[PDB]
Design an enzyme around this catalytic site. Structure first.
Site, PDB file in Angstrom:
ATOM      1  N   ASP A 131       0.815  -1.203   0.000  1.00 57.35           N
ATOM      2  CA  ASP A 131       0.000   0.000   0.000  1.00 57.35           C
ATOM      3  C   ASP A 131       0.852   1.257   0.000  1.00 57.35           C
ATOM      4  O   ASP A 131       0.620   2.211   0.747  1.00 57.35           O
ATOM      5  CB  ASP A 131      -0.991  -0.029   1.178  1.00 57.35           C
ATOM      6  CG  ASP A 131      -2.190   0.852   0.957  1.00 57.35           C
ATOM      7  OD1 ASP A 131      -2.388   1.374  -0.162  1.00 57.35           O
ATOM      8  OD2 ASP A 131      -2.962   1.010   1.935  1.00 57.35           O
ATOM      9  N   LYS A 133       2.028   4.719  -1.125  1.00 51.09           N
ATOM     10  CA  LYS A 133       1.316   5.890  -1.657  1.00 51.09           C
ATOM     11  C   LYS A 133       1.743   7.105  -0.828  1.00 51.09           C
ATOM     12  O   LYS A 133       2.232   6.944   0.285  1.00 51.09           O
ATOM     13  CB  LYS A 133      -0.215   5.711  -1.599  1.00 51.09           C
ATOM     14  CG  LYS A 133      -0.780   5.377  -0.247  1.00 51.09           C
ATOM     15  CD  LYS A 133      -2.325   5.302  -0.257  1.00 51.09           C
ATOM     16  CE  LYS A 133      -2.826   4.789   1.081  1.00 51.09           C
ATOM     17  NZ  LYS A 133      -4.348   4.703   1.090  1.00 51.09           N
ATOM     18  N   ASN A 136       1.085   7.443   2.902  1.00 47.06           N
ATOM     19  CA  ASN A 136       1.822   6.521   3.762  1.00 47.06           C
ATOM     20  C   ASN A 136       3.320   6.793   3.796  1.00 47.06           C
ATOM     21  O   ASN A 136       4.080   5.973   4.312  1.00 47.06           O
ATOM     22  CB  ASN A 136       1.566   5.067   3.365  1.00 47.06           C
ATOM     23  CG  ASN A 136       0.185   4.601   3.788  1.00 47.06           C
ATOM     24  OD1 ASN A 136      -0.445   5.200   4.683  1.00 47.06           O
ATOM     25  ND2 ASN A 136      -0.319   3.560   3.141  1.00 47.06           N
ATOM     26  N   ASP A 149       2.421   2.378   7.813  1.00 44.22           N
ATOM     27  CA  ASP A 149       1.204   1.619   7.493  1.00 44.22           C
ATOM     28  C   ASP A 149       1.555   0.205   7.045  1.00 44.22           C
ATOM     29  O   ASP A 149       1.499  -0.118   5.874  1.00 44.22           O
ATOM     30  CB  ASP A 149       0.323   2.340   6.468  1.00 44.22           C
ATOM     31  CG  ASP A 149      -1.169   2.245   6.809  1.00 44.22           C
ATOM     32  OD1 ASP A 149      -1.687   1.110   6.900  1.00 44.22           O
ATOM     33  OD2 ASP A 149      -1.815   3.299   6.992  1.00 44.22           O
ATOM     34  N   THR A 171      -4.621   0.266  -2.487  1.00 43.49           N
ATOM     35  CA  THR A 171      -5.385   1.482  -2.785  1.00 43.49           C
ATOM     36  C   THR A 171      -5.506   1.573  -4.289  1.00 43.49           C
ATOM     37  O   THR A 171      -4.517   1.421  -4.991  1.00 43.49           O
ATOM     38  CB  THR A 171      -4.637   2.711  -2.179  1.00 43.49           C
ATOM     39  OG1 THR A 171      -4.619   2.592  -0.746  1.00 43.49           O
ATOM     40  CG2 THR A 171      -5.354   3.999  -2.561  1.00 43.49           C
TER      41      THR A 171
HETATM   42  N1  LIG Z   1       4.141   8.066  13.377  1.00 39.79           N
HETATM   43  C1  LIG Z   1       3.311   9.096  13.054  1.00 39.79           C
HETATM   44  N2  LIG Z   1       3.661  10.398  13.211  1.00 39.79           N
HETATM   45  C2  LIG Z   1       2.836  11.411  12.841  1.00 39.79           C
HETATM   46  N3  LIG Z   1       1.605  11.226  12.316  1.00 39.79           N
HETATM   47  C3  LIG Z   1       1.172   9.963  12.115  1.00 39.79           C
HETATM   48  C4  LIG Z   1       1.991   8.808  12.480  1.00 39.79           C
HETATM   49  N4  LIG Z   1       1.331   7.668  12.169  1.00 39.79           N
HETATM   50  C5  LIG Z   1       0.131   8.092  11.665  1.00 39.79           C
HETATM   51  N5  LIG Z   1       0.047   9.428  11.635  1.00 39.79           N
HETATM   52  C6  LIG Z   1      -1.115  10.157  11.110  1.00 39.79           C
HETATM   53  O1  LIG Z   1      -2.242   9.640  11.773  1.00 39.79           O
HETATM   54  C7  LIG Z   1      -3.345   9.371  10.902  1.00 39.79           C
HETATM   55  C8  LIG Z   1      -3.961   7.996  11.169  1.00 39.79           C
HETATM   56  O2  LIG Z   1      -3.087   6.924  10.868  1.00 39.79           O
HETATM   57  P1  LIG Z   1      -3.484   5.391  11.089  1.00 39.79           P
HETATM   58  O3  LIG Z   1      -2.362   4.467  10.665  1.00 39.79           O
HETATM   59  O4  LIG Z   1      -4.096   5.252  12.471  1.00 39.79           O
HETATM   60  O5  LIG Z   1      -4.738   5.315  10.058  1.00 39.79           O
HETATM   61  P2  LIG Z   1      -4.762   5.511   8.441  1.00 39.79           P
HETATM   62  O6  LIG Z   1      -3.857   4.481   7.787  1.00 39.79           O
HETATM   63  O7  LIG Z   1      -4.711   6.971   8.030  1.00 39.79           O
HETATM   64  O8  LIG Z   1      -6.321   5.145   8.259  1.00 39.79           O
HETATM   65  P3  LIG Z   1      -6.992   3.837   7.607  1.00 39.79           P
HETATM   66  O9  LIG Z   1      -6.749   2.677   8.544  1.00 39.79           O
HETATM   67  O10 LIG Z   1      -8.441   4.274   7.558  1.00 39.79           O
HETATM   68  O11 LIG Z   1      -6.297   3.717   6.261  1.00 39.79           O
HETATM   69  C9  LIG Z   1      -2.806   9.540   9.501  1.00 39.79           C
HETATM   70  O12 LIG Z   1      -3.254  10.825   9.068  1.00 39.79           O
HETATM   71  C10 LIG Z   1      -1.318   9.668   9.675  1.00 39.79           C
HETATM   72  O13 LIG Z   1      -0.833  10.632   8.748  1.00 39.79           O
HETATM   73 MG   LIG Z   2      -2.323   5.106   6.022  1.00 37.86          MG
HETATM   74 MG   LIG Z   3      -2.873   3.034   8.912  1.00 30.28          MG
END
Ligand SMILES: Nc1ncnc2c1ncn2[C@@H]1O[C@H](COP(=O)(O)OP(=O)(O)OP(=O)(O)O)[C@@H](O)[C@H]1O
Ligand SMILES: [Mg+2]
Ligand SMILES: [Mg+2]
Ligand SMILES: O=C(C[C@@H](c1ccccc1)C(C(=O)O)C(=O)O)c1ccc(Cl)cc1
Length: 285
Positions: A131, A133, A136, A149, A171
């Site tokens: 995934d 992109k 991520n 991710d 995606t």
């Molecule tokens: N280590 C990090 N530092 C800063 N921001 C982060 C970090 N990890 C995630 N984020 C931000 O937090 C948000 C949520 O991430 P999370 O992995 O919980 O879900 P996601 O992959 O965006 O959602 P989904 O599971 O619906 O695809 C994202 O916008 C990401 O940019």
């Molecule tokens: Mg993500």
């Molecule tokens: Mg995620």
């Protein structure tokens, strides 16, 4: 040795996903900052997400490279799951593409080089991301990439010399033709996503795009895309060597030791590969 929620002071919400909330936290005993990803057990169980939680932990536990978000610890309590992650202060690469519209050649080359370096490491460990992109690819305080991710990543088994993985994840804009048509992905699938990302950095949008996933899939499998005017010629050549329907013919598949031949592409001539994470990134404007 396991940490506990009370070991931290929580601050601002960094972001939210369909099943998660990421919150900035300070560890009281050390004053270190972490991004803590928090999931609700009840929701994880209902939405059939348990295996993805353990996969995210297990895959990240194997990684130790500058261009990936680091997983420092995990813990849980009666209601919640917690991942302690390195904080990527500057957020998603996607935000910068949208604001600036596209990247100049120097910035495209630099960020593409970091992603190549990262994928060389990941694929060297027999792990495919699946995934990849801009959303991520996070950016740390120094504006180096921090890929994230991993709940839909796959560790390919060394014991069976596994090359292909069978879960349908990804995606639509970045999904490979082999996943759509053969129902399997491999390391080369991440090289297809890289080709899409390079195109997007230059052109401002990814190459296969539509308001409906099915419409995107139809274009992917026909290699139906075009380059805009002014697209840096060496970048165009590189994209054309990555967006190849036959996954065995994408640049980088020559051998399994590294991405030597991909690094040697003319687009990267000026790149010093060895110390990329210590170089000052070019300013994005
Ligand atoms: N280590 C990090 N530092 C800063 N921001 C982060 C970090 N990890 C995630 N984020 C931000 O937090 C948000 C949520 O991430 P999370 O992995 O919980 O879900 P996601 O992959 O965006 O959602 P989904 O599971 O619906 O695809 C994202 O916008 C990401 O940019
Ligand atoms: Mg993500
Ligand atoms: Mg995620
Ligand atoms: O993987 C774990 C627990 C695991 C865990 C994985 C990821 C994030 C937090 C906890 C934990 C452990 O095995 O001891 C740990 O690593 O501390 C888990 C996943 C889903 C649900 Cl609903 C309940 C538990």
């Amino acid at each position: 040795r396991k940490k506990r929620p009370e070991d931290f002071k929580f601050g601002k919400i960094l972001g939210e996903g369909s099943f998660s909330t990421v919150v900035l936290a300070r560890e009281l005993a050390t004053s270190r900052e972490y991004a803590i990803k928090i999931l609700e057990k009840r929701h994880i169980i209902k939405e059939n997400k348990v295996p993805y939680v353990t996969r995210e932990r297990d895959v990240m536990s194997r990684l130790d490279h500058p261009f990936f978000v680091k997983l420092y610890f995990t813990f849980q309590d009666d209601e919640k799951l917690y991942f302690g992650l390195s904080y990527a202060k500057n957020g998603e690469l996607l935000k910068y593409i949208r604001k600036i519209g596209s990247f100049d050649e120097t910035c495209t080359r630099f960020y593409t080089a970091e992603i190549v370096s990262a994928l060389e490491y990941l694929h060297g460990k027999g792990i495919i991301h699946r995934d990849l992109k801009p959303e991520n690819i996070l950016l740390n305080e120094d504006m180096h990439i921090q890929i994230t991710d991993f709940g839909t990543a796959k560790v390919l088994s060394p014991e069976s010399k596994q090359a292909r993985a069978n879960s349908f994840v990804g995606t639509a804009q970045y999904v490979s033709p082999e996943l759509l048509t053969e129902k399997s992905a491999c390391k080369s699938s991440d090289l297809w996503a890289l080709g899409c990302i390079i195109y997007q950095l230059v052109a401002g949008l990814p190459p296969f795009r539509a308001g409906n996933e099915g419409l995107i899939f139809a274009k992917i499998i026909k290699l139906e895309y075009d380059f805009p005017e002014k697209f840096f010629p060496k970048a165009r050549d590189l994209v054309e060597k990555l967006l190849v329907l036959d996954a065995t013919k994408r640049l980088g598949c020559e051998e399994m030791e590294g991405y030597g031949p991909l690094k040697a592409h003319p687009f990267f001539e000026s790149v010093t590969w060895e110390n990329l994470h210590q170089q000052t990134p070019p300013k994005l404007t």
